[PDB]
Symmetry: D3
Subunit: 311 residues, 6 copies
């Protein structure tokens, strides 16, 4: 019975009022690998120490390893579906970016994430180089920067566990997951110039009432229509924890999309439908106001596996 990381529990508990996405790369050399492998076993103790002081803080941290990082750190067989993120070249472009270790830190207060990230980076020292560091926050009542409520159709409780945690398909990694991260920059002026009814149709839900739309009223290019896919005749869901972020001073507004799954094929299919179009040419209008500049895939191993690594 391998203990799994806090992947779906924080979402269901619904306490993440602040988050930090930290994508770092391992510097060349064996010493950096040794330092990272040593810090792997103490990550859990750091998590407990940093978040025990602030009760009801909901502090959690998910560590993910990409294909290159896993090749550099653990040379044993890799998971079945672990591979470099595939770029998509359709009506829009989804680039692939370097990354070896992903730290997704969530807490009910920003200071907890700040302290945990500072401790992690200080312990890692010069062994890693920070590639991306995004500080996301909950915007109003679970709304994103486009004004629409996000996260409604996420699976809850047992459904989330069945959708994210890997079963017996890859026993040697039972309890792991696959995470896909992307960063979108929004064109708020263009979105705001769009009439409210057009946004109504594009998203496929309602703005204020957050109630869905009837199948007779949702066009073929609705966001929730293109992202609805099925396997073996049954609909399969993924866990999303998109977080708004930005800096007003530089005029930067964006959303950090993060998706957990037991199979990255589902998320890749959803990305293909959104970018290439299903059928081709029928792309999602959301990409007309949102630009993707960062995208990567990581593997999330079990907590016991992390605690079982010897330097």
């Amino acid at each position: 019975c391998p203990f799994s990381q806090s992947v779906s529990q924080p979402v269901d508990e619904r306490l993440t009022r602040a988050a930090i996405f930290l994508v770092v790369t391992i510097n060349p050399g064996k010493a950096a690998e040794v330092a990272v492998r040593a810090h792997c076993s103490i990550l859990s103790s750091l998590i407990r120490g940093v978040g025990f002081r602030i009760s009801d803080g909901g502090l959690s941290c998910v560590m993910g390893v990409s294909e290159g990082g896993w090749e550099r750190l653990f040379g044993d067989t890799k998971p079945e579906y672990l591979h470099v993120f595939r770029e998509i070249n359709g009506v829009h472009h989804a680039p692939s970016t370097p990354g070896d270790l992903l730290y997704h830190i969530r807490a009910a207060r920003m200071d907890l994430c700040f302290e945990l990230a500072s401790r992690i980076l200080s312990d890692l020292g010069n062994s890693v180089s920070v590639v991306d560091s995004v500080q996301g926050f909950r915007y109003f009542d679970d709304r994103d920067l486009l004004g629409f409520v996000d996260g409604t159709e996420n699976p809850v409780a047992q459904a989330a566990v069945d959708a994210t945690l890997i079963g017996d398909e890859d026993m040697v990694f039972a309890g792991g997951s696959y995470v896909i991260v992307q960063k979108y920059l929004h064109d708020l002026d263009k979105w705001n110039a769009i009439p409210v009814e057009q946004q109504e149709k594009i998203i496929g839900r309602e703005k204020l009432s957050d109630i869905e739309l009837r199948d007779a009223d949702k066009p073929s290019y609705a966001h929730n229509v293109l992202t609805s896919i099925e396997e073996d005749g049954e609909d399969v869901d993924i866990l999303r924890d998109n977080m708004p972020f930005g800096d007003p001073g530089k005029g930067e507004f964006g959303t950090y999309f993060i998706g957990y799954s037991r199979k990255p094929e589902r998320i890749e299919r959803m990305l293909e439908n959104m970018f290439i179009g299903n059928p081709p040419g029928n792309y999602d209008r959301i990409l007309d106001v949102s630009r993707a500049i960062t995208g990567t895939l990581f593997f999330v191993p079990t907590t016991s596996f992390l605690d079982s690594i010897e330097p």
Copy 2:
């Protein structure tokens, strides 16, 4: 009876869990001045609209105008003590930076400050250029990044009103104030290498217990000793709302110092004592781990005066 801005009330209410310091400069041309003057009268309506939706949000915004901005916008006589911030050249350097308008936004949640700053910048458009935009947050239990509780000796209720709000010295501006803003970048590795007793003596208070030290145990260069000054034989206090800020990914850690007063002479004297030393050469050791890179002085007029400007 001129209505004063929310200068001391937010501090006493103690609800600022997040803040944004936005220092912008007015672009050359009369059109930019006209746009700023028009937005001046609608700032209050924007504040009310943005912060009424989130009850117990504690949203407040203080707008300050520097000497150059006041000269460009209102050509009538200026306040008595409004002048360009004086740089200090002692054992350390405190630079002076350009700035025309200061927006100090405070709220119990980050999203309110985000929305207010975005609305203000969108309304201002191209008339202003953003010089500095710092997002500060409350760190643990009112502690700064150095680990010491900050804000203990702030005046409360009537004392704060008497210390910040201008009396009859400049009737034509009764209800205004002077605000001095600085940005400090910390060297946390050097501070952490310092023994706990040395930090104990340098700050002049205790770390955990936050209790003061006896006058027989505080050296002449204690931080709370050098910052204690008197006028006409009576001690005079200032209102401080320093806010920690930073980005772990770039390794940036700092504190945004903000000080309100009825007379900037007090804050300038405190800065002279800290940097030059009282007596000279006996500087505060805090500057040995903190570097000042931004410093400016602004004037905060009354709410009625802001509402009374005609474009």
Copy 3:
């Protein structure tokens, strides 16, 4: 593994600060049946949409179908214990009232229940006719209008699951339940004229201390004595969520009794003991100040069964 509705979880979580009981009847005609069957599959999506926006809202909705409604909607075999509620003619009368669909909506705030009920009724349109619509609220510290704490002896966690959810007795409906609803109108003047010790003995517990009474001090007609019944030599419990309601202007005060079980025989036996008396003539004095005007029985199917209906 059929997913069960939120029957016992809201009670154990203890967040229902407001509730709406909506008993409606299906209008004659096949079109109304088709509309209800279509709305059955979208009820869950409506629930999620309406209650995701208000975090920690605890919004839940239980839909129940009576014998006539089940006969009109699904013509396949009915559950084993689904039948028209039996009226009781003893010292008091418990009438039976028409009803086809029951909506029990619970939330921590009244507005969520209001929005959900409005959406449900708007979607149903003219296909249904509202028979009863009662808005109940939590009165002080879980007290009913008679001044006594109610809900103390409810089963918690696993006991509630074993008492409410149907096991293998009716496999084809595993995960369902039976719900019995009644509406009582109180005579508060008569109850208040009764001495505190007489109410002490009638209820069988204490008023303020909410502690029980010794078996030597509880008469044979104590409320908690007559409602304590056993099956096969073992005591069996039922889940109750009685909610006070009323309108001061019309002088209307009452309690909405709702009871969930895996077998309605237990609740019917409890009703027989309370009304007819055990032994006959030894009725509960609570009925001397409370009048029952509405009573109905419904069947609560599983969430998966509701989602699996095709129009």
Copy 4:
């Protein structure tokens, strides 16, 4: 220094999550007048007793007396502006309804208002007859049933005191106020069929962002334009505490408008502008979906005056 009732303090404190408007008429006979006059002096003790038990409950009650009630109860000179509410016959009709005593009860929980109203009605007994009894609740984030945030432009702190409390114009009643109550029933289907931009223009603010509109974009019949009036060249504000209410089962949806002032002439002018039109024929479109069925004017005396009445 006459102590004033909690007229503006509850609004500024912003804790009214539930309210009850109870309009009753005094039955003919001297005994009813004597009973009401006796209960007048014990109303404050009842208020304290009922609301002291639930800390942070924010329980308050405002008692108002109409012209007829004041004539029947106190035969001394009446306030200057106390008169029967004037009906308005323009494009829409605003009826006048009987009423002698008004009880506006507000609390953070519904049960407190329930208990206070029940106690008041029980103490009054048969001396009064209930004419209207409306239970209002806060809908989502201070939004009314039309989906727009209401209460943004209300005066706060000293402005509210100067707008509601009577000064020296009628010394003998210093500290009193005038309250105008109306009940509106909404046609939600017609409002919802209206496009979002048309509602945008009709209300004069924005829906989600709750930010105002520029004077170049608000038509002459915007709701906030017609309700903006001035006295002696200065804009004068009134205090509004409109509360949504309704029953889904009967399909009843409405808003209870309540307005406090030091002079009812302002509210009457606002009503004339909304109904007759300014200029005539340019009425507010809100009345096209809202029907007024109840409207009355009451006088709110000081707490000391209420405590000083001898039976």
Copy 5:
């Protein structure tokens, strides 16, 4: 304008969930007096330091000096009404106990009071000897150990200020107050054996409903009747903050009565009415189940006076 201590503000704010009453005596010798006089000026700094860390903690501390302590510490003229507490010998006995300094510490959490008391005692060292140290806590919903709600008839806001703070009767001490402290030990078995109606009549209010009783139903020996006294034909109120306390293990149950006034004559008259009887022989039945073992009177000077003492 002398600043007054937090005497009435904590009660009106209603945040005291825990309190510590510490009555200590000054050891003989001039050194103890010097140490106490030195700690007097740093008490405020200690208060701020100890309670700034726990936001919304509501930490306050009132220091009072008795007649002997004032004679030993300050040899200048004493307040007009400062004298040794007078023992009362009627049907019951109210003893007088030694005491020089009184510390009434209040906070929303017990740990704050613990820390403040520990710091005060550590700073005082051997200069003082602890006579009494009682840890009181709020019992349920502002109820005392007898089951009745206490504190309902306390003056609020301006009335409390006028009742507690000394006016111009003793200018040299404007802003001070007089505090009377007593400790009562309850006989809960005897009180519980008393019927609920007899307790109803003895207290003079209701138990659950906390509503008063009509003057025709309250006997002459009701607790709220004997404690209602008038000066110059006008009723005068006092501020009470009675706190339940006890230890179950030793079977000790009691109430710590504390009363603030601008004139101790009112509290002494109330004590005479309760113990001797008004008329004599008509004593309060509360003393039949409560025994007084400690009683003392102290003077509370202004905060500025405390800060102005030089060792």
Copy 6:
């Protein structure tokens, strides 16, 4: 499936803001045993009644029986590891104290524990004699009186269940546990005189940051090093709920250590390592400032076993 008591659930839920440890002895005679056996079956009903009224109160009570109490009450075979606590005579002394029944009461408020303890003692009457009664409270942010965060390394969720609840080693008592209680009195003056770095090394963690220390920096006598033991090559954890307590007036400061386990051998080994030393002579320095005066071992049976006892 025997239902287990609330042993690990309250700790994981993290709501114990107040606790009472009540160690009592059974008086000689069969009547006392009969009374205790009768109260055993009603303890659960008392718990539910006392803690249902205060929602989110987190009230729980654990009843434990020592070897002598179990011999006097139930004469059937005892658990495998139930025995009298063994005193330890090394560099320090850990005494053994009499005790028959242990009541560990926990709640989010002190009043709930007070009421429950009072009810339990009143029901027990003269059948038991109170030996120890300690009222503990949470000190600041889960810190003990020594200033270090305590409870960080406690097992959570499934690990706690596996560490505390007895498996199949003693089937007849499956679901029980063993609890070891000790009372330590602290010498705060000696601890405070110790430099912060020496406390840093003695505890083995950090004070403010609550982060652990590297194995190269923790000496052999670190507290967390000596208390880390293994069974069969695997580390085994125990559940600790130490609670600070004391009385400032008497200068009494201490910590009540409580430890739950499926095997008391682990706790006895930890005590031997701390007191005797591992290797001998290398004792924990914590005992140099803390004195143990009370120590006892009890057995905690299942809830079903308690409910199944017949008087």
